[PDB]
Each structure stands twice: as structure tokens, then as C-alpha cells.
């Protein structure tokens, strides 16, 4: 499991957000197990969670994610 | 499982968002197991979750995701 | 499972969003198992989930996703 | 499990956010186990969770995440 | 499990946030186990959790996260 990233090197990249929420419940990244034997989970990269969510320009530079997720029996 | 990313190198990339929500529930990335034996899960890359979700220009630079997900018995 | 991405190098890329929702429930990426033996899942790339969802210019740069998902018995 | 990142080297990168929420519950990254035997979880990269969440320009420089998640029996 | 990061080398990178919340509960990163045998968890990288969360320019320099998470029996 190898990840390699290389980077070699007027409004730009500007965000305005206004949010109004009377009630918010946000769970993000969740793993829940109840009465479970084996649970293998991988979350990688960018997760944005919101009642309002904005992602801008998330990976302008090279980004690499490598995941091996699992079990051997 | 190998990921490689390489990058070699007027309004641009501008977002305006206004959101109003009286109630919001957002779950993002969730794995739930109830009475489960084996559960293998991989989430990779960018997940944006919102009552309002905006993704702009997510990977201008080279992005790589590699996933191997599973079990061997 | 190999992914390689290479990048070599007036309004442009501008988004305006207004959203009003009295109630929102959003689930994003979810895996649920109930009374399940084996569940192998992979989510890759960009997922945008919203009561309002906008994706703009998601991968201007080269993007690669490679997935192997499964089991060997 | 190896990750390598290399970086070699008018409003730019500016965000305005206004948020008003009467009530907020946010869970971030959560792993919950109840009556569970084995639970292996990995969260990698950037997670932004909010009643309002903004991510801007998250990885301008090269970013690498490598994960191996799992069990061998 | 090896991570290597190398870096070699008008408003820029400016954020304004105003937030008003009458009530906030935020959980950040949480692992909870109740009546559980084995629970292995890894959280890596940047997690921002908020009733309002903003992440700007999180990794301009090269960032690497490597995780091996799991058990061998």
C-alpha cells in the first residue's frame, strides 16, 4: 500500500458562505458496530460534512490515496 | 495497491453560497453493522455531504486513488 | 490495483448557490449490514450529496481511481 | 504502508463565512462498538465536520495517504 | 509504516468567520466501546470539527500520512 505525491513548480480561490440553521445534527465519519464480529473500515481523503458543506480546490497539488482494507483468514 | 500523483508546473475559482435550513441532519460517511460477521469497507476520495453541498475544482492537480478492499479465506 | 495520475503544465470556474430548506436529512455514503455475513464495499472518487448538491470542475487535472473489491475463498 | 509527498518550488485563497445556528450537535469522527468482537478502523486525510463546514484549498502541496487496515488470522 | 514529506523552496490565505450558536455540542474524534472485545482505531491527518468548521489551505507543504491499523492472530 504505497501512495506517492509529487508537486514541482482578480480573485482566485475565493469563497463566501452564509449559513443559518435553526437545528443541526451532523455525523461526520462514523463506524458503528452492534453485536458484530469483524468490522474493518477505512476512510481516506477529504470528507467534508455539513448542514452546509463547501469544498473548494481540495487537491490543487498532486494527491494520492492508497488503501488496502480487509482480512485474511 | 499503489497510487501515484504527479503535478509539474477576472474571477477564477470563486464560489458564493447562501444556505438557510430550519432543520438539518447529515450523516457523512457511515458504516453500520448490526449482528454482522464480516464487513469490510473502504471510502476513498472526496466526499462532500451537506444539506447544501458544494464541491468546486476538487482535484485540479493530478489525484490518484487506489483501493483493494476485501477478504481472502 | 494501481492508479497513476500525471499533470504537466472574465469569470472562470465561478459558482453561485442559494439554498433554502426547511428540513434536510442527508446520508452521504452509507454501508449498512444487518444479520449479514460478508459485505465488502468500496466507494471511490468524488461523491457529493446534498439536499442541494453542486459539483463543478471536479477533476480538471488528471484523476485516476482503481478499485479491486471482493473476496477469494 | 508507505506514503511519500514531495513539494518543490488580487485576492487568492480568501474565505468569508458567516454562520448562525440556534442548536448544533456535531460528531466529527466516531467509532462506536457495542457488544462487538473485532473492530478495526482507520480514518485518514482531512475530515471537516460542521453544522457549517468549509474546506478550501485543502492540499495545495502534494499530499499522500496510505492505509492498510485489517486483520490476519 | 513509513511516511516521508519533503518541501523545498493583495490578500493571500485570509479567512473571516463569524459564528453565533445558542447551543453547541461537538464530539471531535471519539472512540467508544461498550462490552467490546477488541477495538483498534487510528485517526490520522487533520480533523476539524465544529458547529462551524473551517479548514483553509490545510497542507500547502507536502503532507504524508501512513497508517497500518489492525490485528494479527
List residues in chain E that are followed by a break over 2.5 Å (C to N): 9
| 3-state class (DSSP) for residue E11 | strand
Q: Would you say D41 and D33 are in contact if contact means Cβ atoms under 8 Å apart?
A: no
Across A27-62, where does the E strand assignment appear? 29-34, 38-43, 47-56
| Method of determination used here | cryo-EM
Residue A58 DSSP class: T
d(CA D2, CA B64): 15
Query: Which residues, in sequence order, are CB contacts of C55 under 8 Å at separation 6+?
Result: B54, B55, B56, B58, C46, C48
A31 φ, ψ to 5°? -120, 125
Query: How far is residue A51's CA from residue B52's CA, in Å, rounded to a whole number?
Result: 6
Task: Report the residue count for chain A.
Answer: 73
CB contact under 8 A, C54 and B55: yes
Choose among A35, E18, E34: nearest CA to C34: A35
Neighbouring C-beta atoms of residue E69, cutoff 10 Å: 25
Strands (E), B1-73: 2-8, 11-12, 15-26, 29-34, 38-43, 47-56, 63-72
Q: Which chains reach chain A with 3 or more Cβ–Cβ distances below 8 angstroms?
A: B, C, D, E
| Cβ contact C52:B17 at 8 Å | no
Interchain proximity B1–C1, CB inside 8 Å: yes
User: How close is the nearest chain D Cα to the Cα of B1, in Å?
Assistant: 9
The contacts of residue D54 (CB under 8 Å, 6+ apart) are A15, A17, A48, A50, A53, A54, A55, A56, D15, D17, D48, E53, E54, E55, E56
Resolution (Å units)? 2.7
After which residues is chain C discontinuous, taking C to N > 2.5 Å?
9
Pairing of strands B38-43, A38-43: parallel
Selection from B17, B50, D54 nearest residue A18 by Cα: B17
Contact A24, A51 (CB under 8 A): yes
The contact set of B with D (CB < 8 A) is 3, 5, 7, 24, 28, 40, 42, 50, 61
What phi and psi, each to the nearest 5 degrees, are found at residue A68?
-115, 125
Q: For residues B36 and C33, is the Cβ–Cβ distance under 8 A?
A: yes
Whether D47 sits inside 8 A of A70 (CB atoms) is no
* Contact check, Cβ <8 Å, C36/B31: no
Q: For residues D7 and A5, what is the distance between their CA atoms, to the nearest angstrom?
A: 8
Amino acid at each position: 500500500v504505497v501512495a506517492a505525491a509529487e508537486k514541482t513548480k482578480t480573485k482566485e480561490g475565493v469563497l463566501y458562505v452564509g449559513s443559518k440553521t435553526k437545528e443541526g445534527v451532523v455525523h461526520g465519519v462514523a463506524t458503528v458496530a452492534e453485536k458484530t464480529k469483524e468490522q474493518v473500515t477505512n476512510v481516506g481523503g477529504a470528507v467534508v460534512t455539513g448542514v452546509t458543506a463547501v469544498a473548494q480546490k481540495t487537491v490543487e497539488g498532486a494527491g494520492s490515496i492508497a488503501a488496502a482494507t480487509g482480512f485474511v483468514k
